[PDB]
Amino acid sequence: RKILIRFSDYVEVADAQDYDRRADKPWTRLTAADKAAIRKELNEFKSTEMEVHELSRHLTRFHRP
Amino acid sequence: LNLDSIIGRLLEVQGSRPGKNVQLTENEIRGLCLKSREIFLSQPILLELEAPLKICGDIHGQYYDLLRLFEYGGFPPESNYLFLGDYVDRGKQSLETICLLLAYKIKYPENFFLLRGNHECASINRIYGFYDECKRRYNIKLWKTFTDCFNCLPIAAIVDEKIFCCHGGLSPDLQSMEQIRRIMRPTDVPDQGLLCDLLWSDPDKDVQGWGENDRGVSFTFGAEVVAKFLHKHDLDLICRAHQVVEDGYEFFAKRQLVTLFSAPNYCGEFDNAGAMMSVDETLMCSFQILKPAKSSETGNLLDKD
Ligand SMILES: [Mn+2]
Ligand SMILES: [Mn+2]
């Protein structure tokens, strides 16, 4: 099969910004109860508020509380 | 919508200390969401794009790196762009990041494109940082507005009938491109099926066919799957994102697939470069990298046990 794509043999490199990229990890501070409440919150949000096309309702991702 | 003012304020922090926030109003951000959502719905869910284009992988709220990437590649509309998703979560400035990308989609709707990553859905970005960032700076209702916008993002793109682009990867349920075109928006991302896989799957050199994915979601796929897919659809390359790679790009299956990752020094925990792939009008593909001078894989945290 004929292939059209080709790749350059030379990559351009420059220096990334030098700064502190560390970020908070809120998902490490979830108790079992917090997770249950988030599952419930998401379920209620997707059941009552989040608009979804009629032909895509089967794709909405619900959680087991 | 005061679009030009918004863009100028977003870009103004370029000369500033990293991490300076941009003070957009709630109503400005809502407008970015609503106007971009309309444009996403007016364009196909499977984009058909033409080179020249620069293609970028994950950003994850690393706003100062996004600014650097545009400085390096050319600020819109000097170059056309396609981003492969994962704009939010797991970085410090998801809001500025997504607001600039939505602003450029509205300003340059035929020259600037955004695909959906697995973090552009409610269940994932509820927990990996975006909801909390919205709540701190604005309110939960604004996060719900973002969700409505994300639920309308396109899912894949084909560049010049030859490069198939998506966030995650292939699916055992992908037999025809019409199956992508038939997906109706707004939609959530399901926990399994074609739309899940396009946003979640990974290549694996040791899998023959389809395998389990240790994210707890979707599949892995082998090199032979890639080769058969390209041959069936007369494509030359799969271009995807979704995994940190040391040089910002990494080939798979004798260069039949490439992974792009555009957030250097990801989360301050990895020593990777961020890359973009520039495709010229002759379909010559080149890489521009910004190099610093599984822990990183999002999985099934909220639902496992
Ligand atoms: Mn990612
Ligand atoms: Mn991802």
Author numbering:
A (entry chain C): 516 to 580
B (entry chain A): 7 to 299, 326 to 337
Question: What do the authors report?
Answer:
The three Protein Phosphatase 1 (PP1) isoforms regulate diverse cellular processes, acting in partnership with over 200 different PP1-interacting proteins (PIPs). The four Phosphatase and actin regulator (Phactr) proteins are novel PIPs that are implicated in cytoskeletal regulation in animal models and cell culture settings. Here, we show that Phactr1 confers sequence-specificity on the Phactr1/PP1 holoenzyme. We show that efficient catalysis requires interactions between conserved hydrophobic residues in the substrate and a novel Phactr1-PP1 composite surface, which comprises a hydrophobic pocket and associated amphipathic cavity with a surrounding basic rim.
In IRSp53, the dephosphorylated residue S455 is flanked by three other potential phosphoacceptors, S453, S454, and T456. We considered the possibility that strong interactions with the Phactr1/PP1 hydrophobic pocket might also allow efficient dephosphorylation of these residues. That this might be the case was suggested by our structural analysis of a phosphomimetic fusion construct, in which the S455 is substituted by glutamate, at 1.39 Å resolution (Phactr1/PP1-IRSp53(S455E)). Strikingly, in this complex, the phospomimetic glutamate (S455E) does not replace phosphate at the catalytic site. Instead, IRSp53 T456 occupies the position corresponding to S455 in the wildtype complex, with a recruited phosphate positioned as in the wild-type complex, and the glutamate (S455E) in effect occupies position −1, pointing away from the catalytic site. Nevertheless, the critical contacts between IRSp53(S455E) L459/L460 and the Phactr1/PP1 hydrophobic pocket are maintained, extending the intervening sequence G457-N458-L459. Consistent with this, both wildtype IRSp53 pT456 and IRSp53 E455/pT456 were effective substrates for Phactr1/PP1, exhibiting three- to fivefold higher KM, but only twofold lower catalytic efficiency, while IRSp53 pS453 and pS454 were very poor substrates, exhibiting 10–30 fold lower catalytic efficiency. Thus, Phactr1/PP1 substrates can tolerate either three or four residues between the target residue and the hydrophobic residue that engages the Phactr1/PP1 hydrophobic pocket (see Discussion). For example, IRSp53 pT456, with only four residues to the pocket-bound L460, has comparable kinetic properties to the bona fide IRSp53 pS455.
